[model samples]
Target: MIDPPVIDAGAVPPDETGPDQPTEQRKICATPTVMPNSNFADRPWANDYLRIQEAQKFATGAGVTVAVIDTGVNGSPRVPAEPGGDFVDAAGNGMSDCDAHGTMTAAIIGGRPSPTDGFVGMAPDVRLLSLRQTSVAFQPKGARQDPNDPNTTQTAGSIRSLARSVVHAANLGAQVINISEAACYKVTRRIDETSLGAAINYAVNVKGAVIVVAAGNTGQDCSQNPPPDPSVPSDPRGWREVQTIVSPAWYDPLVLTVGSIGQNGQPSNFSMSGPWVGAAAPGENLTSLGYDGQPVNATPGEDGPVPLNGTSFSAAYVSGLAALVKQRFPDLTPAQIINRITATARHPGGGVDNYVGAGVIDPVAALTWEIPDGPEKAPFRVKEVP
Candidate 1:
């Protein structure tokens, strides 16, 4: 069993604050707010999409399946066609979105539109499986009866529950599982002594599935004590196997931790930091669909759509990219895919750092690489040797 360290949540210092004076903000600044065009059609970053398409020598994620574990995805114009499932016990209640968070995430990773113009996700053609494991009520303060109990927070599953969900997704033939939720409890609780980590290991080892988890928004180090030993652990800190941790913009070995960067290419103040962060993605001022057909804008405090700046959004980007990679190299192992993405990343500076793993994820580079084949001849072997 994996053994993660236990740390007190209250003991850690508060998160680092952003700049006191707001920098000149980047806005969409366009007419006809709802551009009915394909997400990539009129984007200023069309070059990025063209590069991605050229890199993906093969078809891009057309048949691959991705499982999204979040507040639940609402079927909307902003999201790709997706099927829905439920982990919650609420019977007869479809996991339609109540809050805009899950919908926005889904849109960022997989949204596609016809007629071409404003937005298109990284992997628009991939199939999506929506798994509603969290509730909209979780966002409201005092929603849980025991507010003081850390367990009462959003994550409702025990280690066993999470394991079951992982297994179920694997059985359903999902190539990737995106977990947008984070546990408030110490990583040791599930990583060290329970079956939670094993579930993740099973998905990768036995089922050939890639599991992506959010680095969390709480701003606490999930694995070790803060301040003195913020360094990442050598083993599977929270799970049975060394799964990729996607911090908003930090680097870690166990998982592909992601970080958020604004349109200016600087890390967002709200985005978490640390050496464990792997890569930075577009998280600031992102436009996506909201619940009940209400518009959700990315501008802070704007009511049209929600403005999200967190690792949660970063995870979605990676998940979509993973789909593209999987589509191009169907025979490659999960580790091989991870390495290709990291190896081909455009290093922004001297070398890889906690803030940006291998550098920004270059979809074109990832798709074009001649990755080695499966486990028998795998270039990288990832397994639980213990």
Candidate 2:
């Protein structure tokens, strides 16, 4: 089994971004305050990034199931009551989240609107299957994450059962899966043939679901121990001119890898780049759910939502859009869905394959854009390998 999900602070990537350091989140305390601007006003910026308002006119992701395989989703009145599933029961109870990352990720993917704060999620009507596996990924200051524990290798065995979980999620009728906490460690080079990869393959071919993954936050390369970028002239001892994206995202081509873009509509400095990247989204300094189970799309020190960031959130946003697409066209296969979204996305660089993938995801275009029939529908073949 994958080794217990615990690591030393020293094990953290040198250029770790928020998504890379999912285990190092700071605590959220203090009470509330009266802020005139609620999460509603702040969400427009997020909506503006993908034109989600227009996308929603076609489908609100209603009747679609999106599986969130991360920390637990903090269930609220707007969200479903039994969103939690025991994916990591072998490791822990897998019921609720001690960390806020999964809750935030779920909120971004398909959280319902909060009438109290005027905040609505991307696919507010979409159904959520909260697979609470790494609930303590970002263990608090004092916990079982014994930093010096010798059993913290983070091997594939630690999560060997994940494949079964994916299969189960697919059986539950989930159409999209979001993995926001992926990272490249020294132990594993890639994830193509691993147990997790096999499970993902099953989810895609057998279950007919699409997987969206975080491209990673490390501005550094992972190919080399402390991976290096070979494009730029070496400065002195170790410096990279061009950064390399990390594993899982870099390993498998079937999965749709994503990066983070800022409000400036440019790739974030912390977002990883690579050929495997499928698209980019607004991940820098966006707002979502936080630890208090309240909305986090609010101003600093306000009692409403909290401001969160990372490619993890970006991937979640894409998952929401994909869910909407699935609802709008229930007959489309996973590959067709991929083509519909990526081909329709707006590339800020004016073309695809500029390291930021196809470009920023335009939800409206994904929904309203017409898919070419015949050979046009299959832009690229993504069948499962024997």
Candidate 3:
């Protein structure tokens, strides 16, 4: 996420500027304000739907370390994240939560149970590692700045920084890595993603860490196509032109990509779709780590806390599940863990769809399901009747 400048600088040609180009210098950084909710008393549907309490019986993700790559995480009451590297600034650690997004995502994965609220993360006992790769309120500094011109630097969430964080997490022994952020571009620009893809390959194949990525949200940053026909009804599984390609997520097999679903178990309207999506999770009307001790929803709107909606949070759920799977099945390779998740997911009757992939993840099923030990084979259907 690029830090907003004081004044609008009309878009510059891609070649004229670099990703770390800072149009204006800033003296102070402003952090997001916390909107505390004293009335929130219900457990988030995400936790309830997954039956986390039951799943915890099998595994509490005790021994696995889940790395969160996003805005800095501020560990306090609910979510306790260990100090990690800060790719954004030279002087600060990764514990700074200026945007509150990373903490929210981290909490969705590992927030401890709270007495005041029913909301809790999927893997409450997992070790949370916060790697600050970007922030809405903070700008780049020092070594993170552009090499061409030391004075100019882009925001912290550059692709290079994300790749760096993934490699760092693997080196630091993180068993599960959550990438709640995404980079979108035209499908033709896929070649530029080679570095990020290689990093993920190293993390999963070399380091044996499970990688979870957000399917991405559609907006100006990520383009979408109009319905094939104005009269056609809107359906999550309906066909639509894939106008944009989401990075890291597009690198399938090596990673488990998660899409967003709502309370009704339907694909969220804003969730971008692609064949790479592996599973789905609740990404709306959620409660997660707040700036203060009180639980809060997504970022606050003009009046109050708005519904937390994004594939970013959805990926966190899967990330936590991956940790739990890793802890329980310590011998399972990263690909094996990913396969277990997808094979056990609640599939859409229509089979694999772009919007929700295999379907919403089933935590209890994933943890408790039985699979025969042998080479994977196709399912058998009765043919004797014919």
Candidate 4:
């Protein structure tokens, strides 16, 4: 039987939407450096591996619209974007990017070349659709205490809001959806993720949108500071840790989950290892467009400079490539497009592993690789690596 729509704890109640219940003042999510670095790493290391210039010869994602569901986005002049919608503020459009995270992710996917460094995104011609699904600058209007830490209140991104964002993007004609956000939970805890699951199913099955997700970064519930279970080793060198399960990424096969790799081609220490990860991309020390139309190496945080490192960027790479693939092969179904991406990935150690999944994504290879015979499904975990 089909489950009826349940207004989850994260839902915004009509009674709570009155003028007396106004949200708190908004804070800057990510600050930019004083100057736009003209000498910013002209060619990011990830591009060296991806060879996007060669891939663009065939398809520049001209006809595709990529949806970015994150902390909102204000695309730079080079990376023009249309406002999709907002879930945090009732009257806001998804055009602001207080948190530079969404803007950076959008730039990685489709930002046009910067005149100074000549740095371009993976698919420079893809249309960008910004969906403000979460934010770090604003506290949720109706906050709930965390089960693990009662003192901690819920942030802007909620399960219900994320679910609505996915459906909204699909309804608005987003062919490839990029989700750089993740919810991590202790392995022992039972999560009521039915709504998010249904939304993913609807987007992929009914709306035919390819969803790309971040595998997750270490910290939060997945932190190794004090292992959730001392018995479960947190060392990724051994059997990949499972102390934390990251949502959207762990949804598996349905979405193309991406992990992070550094310039040396090894897994980034912060990127979480999980069987659900299907692809990898260079995520460390990269340059992308800042919200204020400048080049920033790191986010000028309230405390200090915060490094731009996370699987979130890795997922954007895959999403960008997905748009290119979709444009080239418009007839391919979402599942078929996902299959093409994984099947063309350059495997690490000549095989699959959790840290980097099939391997780092090769843009040129993905666009030019021989189409596999017969139908295929999204990549699956064949067996547990010992």
Top TM-score prediction, candidate number: 4
Candidate 3 lDDT score at position 182: 74
lDDT of 1 by residue, 1-386 (tens): 22232222222211111111122213332211232232433443422533544544555568888887676676765564365455443331224654456776776667664454455666777787776555533322324566555444444333234445566667778887777765544333322213444455556666787766665654553432232122535431223332222221111333466666677676566554344556666666555544433334443334542345666777788888888888877877776666776777767664665455566777776777665443431233334345
Instruction: Give per-residue CA lDDT, model 4, range 1-386, as digits (tens).
Output: 01111223333222111111235546746665533443664576677778887888988899899999887888668878889987767777788877778888898999887667656889989999998777768655555445464223242236556777887888899999999877776655555666677778777877899999998888755653221233655443222345566777777678888999988888898988766778999899777778766666687756767657788899999999999999888888888988888888888873777777788888887788887633543343445444
lDDT, residue 169, candidate 3: 83
List where candidate 2 sits over 4 angstroms from the true fold. 1-42, 87-94, 115-118, 135-152, 155-161, 186-193, 219-247, 290-293, 298-306, 348-350, 373-386
10 residues in a row with least lDDT, candidate 3: 1-10
Q: State the displacement of the C-alpha of residue 267, model 1, in Å, after optimal TM-score superposition.
A: 2.6
Best by lDDT: 4
Error of 1 at 164 (Å): 3.1
Rank candidates, TM-score, best first: 4, 3, 2, 1
lDDT of 3 by residue, 258-341 (tens): 999999989999998775677999998777876554577756566866667899899999999998998888988887888889
True-structure RMSD, every candidate? 10.2, 8.7, 9.2, 6.1
Alpha-carbon local distance difference test for all models: 0.54, 0.62, 0.73, 0.75
Provide the clashing-pair count of each candidate structure.
Answer: 41, 12, 2, 0
Look at candidate 1 and tell me the lDDT of residue 325: 85
Could you tell me which 10 consecutive residues in candidate 2 have the lowest summed lDDT? 12-21
* Superposition error at 87 for model 1 (Å): 2.6
Instruction: Please write out the lDDT profile of model 2 over residues 178-223, one tens digit for every residue.
Output: 8764555443232222555556666776668988888877633343
Error of 2 at 75 (Å): 0.6
